[PDB]
Structures are given as structure tokens and as C-alpha cells.
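ugh ok so i messed up the first submission bc i forgot one of the chains. this is the corrected input, ALL of the components this time, i swear. 251 residues overall. if the numbers dont match what u have on ur side tell me asap before i send this to the collaborators (the ones from the other lab, u know who)
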Amino acid sequence: APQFHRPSTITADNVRALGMRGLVLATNNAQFIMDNSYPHPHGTQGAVREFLRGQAAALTDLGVTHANNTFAPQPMFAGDAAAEWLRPSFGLKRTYSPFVV
Amino acid sequence: APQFHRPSTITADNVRALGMRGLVLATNNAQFIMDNSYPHPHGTQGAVREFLRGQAAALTDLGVTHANNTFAPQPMFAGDAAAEWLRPSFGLKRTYSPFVV
Amino acid sequence: TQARAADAADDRPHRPADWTVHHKIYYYVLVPAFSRGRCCTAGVRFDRV
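and heres the new structure output, hopefully the right one now
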């Protein structure tokens, strides 16, 4: 589990393996004191770059848990078709309700 | 089954036997790479012609599966009736709801 | 175009004389009264359509 009061602890695997619901209360229950005798290897600005590589891979894991809720998203914009010679490519102005009962 | 990445395969018998429910998916799920080692005998413009009689004559098939649904086709206009010598030929504006429970 | 494709037509029409005049009213006049320059035609790929 990552510790959010230390700069050199937050990795990509510590954020992705932790759940999105579990990411809320883990960061809210950290320590106010920031420690500064052993820093993150890419500096103080570089640790924020590494933290955001876990949340971007977490919605793709959240999309699997909600894959039984929505459909397969058909393309949004034209120029995307296999058969472009007898029909056009449509483009979804996605006003639909993606929901599976 | 007609292969949609070679134009030398589309005939009218192969598309009319295919329903229009399934022709939505078969067009978007094909291979993007157009092939050009087997051309068409009516030209490539004639291959589009052979595709669309395959769709138009298939519209009877999607309608015959819904033959327990709509009503009898009323004569839309005058001139379409047998006995003309005392009463006219009506024309029925087909603005109704064709639906049989 | 007519209602009776059974009583078909190549030489003898179905429409009144003012019918195309009415279209000449509707196309040449009224649509420019709403256009302010912004409308244009289209040639149809009915095979694509």
C-alpha cells in the first residue's frame, strides 16, 4: 500500500492495484507532516507524474466492472468505416442511454 | 457467405438471403484493406448495382417476417378499384398505425 | 412522380400548368427569402443513398 506523506513511495502499481473506492479513504487518512530527508528520485514534481499513471489505468479496470452495464461503443465520427464505397461512415452524436437491464 | 473485401463475390442471391438486421453488423466489422487482384465483370460501379438489388429485393423478406403485424395495403389513390360505374374509387391516406396485436 | 404508377406517363402529365410555376415560386423566391446567401444544392449518389 502506498504512503501519501512520502515522496519516494507512490508508484504506478500502488495506485492501480488499490481500488477507486479504496483510493478515496487512503489519501484522506494520511499525515499532514511532509518528510524531506529522503526524496523522490525524479524530484518533488516528478512524483506527481507517477501518481497520475495509476488513475488513468484505473478507469479501464472500472470499465470492466461496468462492462455488463453498457454496450460496445460504435464510432462517433465519420471517416471510420470498413465499407466506404457503397455507404458513408456514420458518426454517433451519442445521445443514447448506455444501459443494460 | 459473401466476402466484403473482394468485390468479385457480391451477387443478388447472396444478399437477399441475408436479412437487413445482420447487414448492419457485417458492413462495420469487415476488413479495411480493399483488395484488387480479382475485379468485377460489370465493373466496380456494377458491383454496387449488384449490391443494391440484393438489398431492395431483400425488403420483401424483412416485411414477410412482419406479415402478422401490418394491415392490408389500402388503395392510396383513386383509379384502384374494380366497380366504377356507380361509386368512385377511393384513395385512402395511409396515415394510420399499421399494427395488429 | 405521380400517384398512379399503374397509369404511367412518358408524354401526358398529371400536374396542372401552375405546378412547376409554384415550384418556381417556392424555389427561386421563398428559399432566397430565408437564405441570405446560405443554401446550396446537392448531387445525389442514390446508390449510396
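quick check: The first helix of chain C runs from residue 18 to 35. that seems consistent at least. DSSP finds one helix and no strands in chain C.
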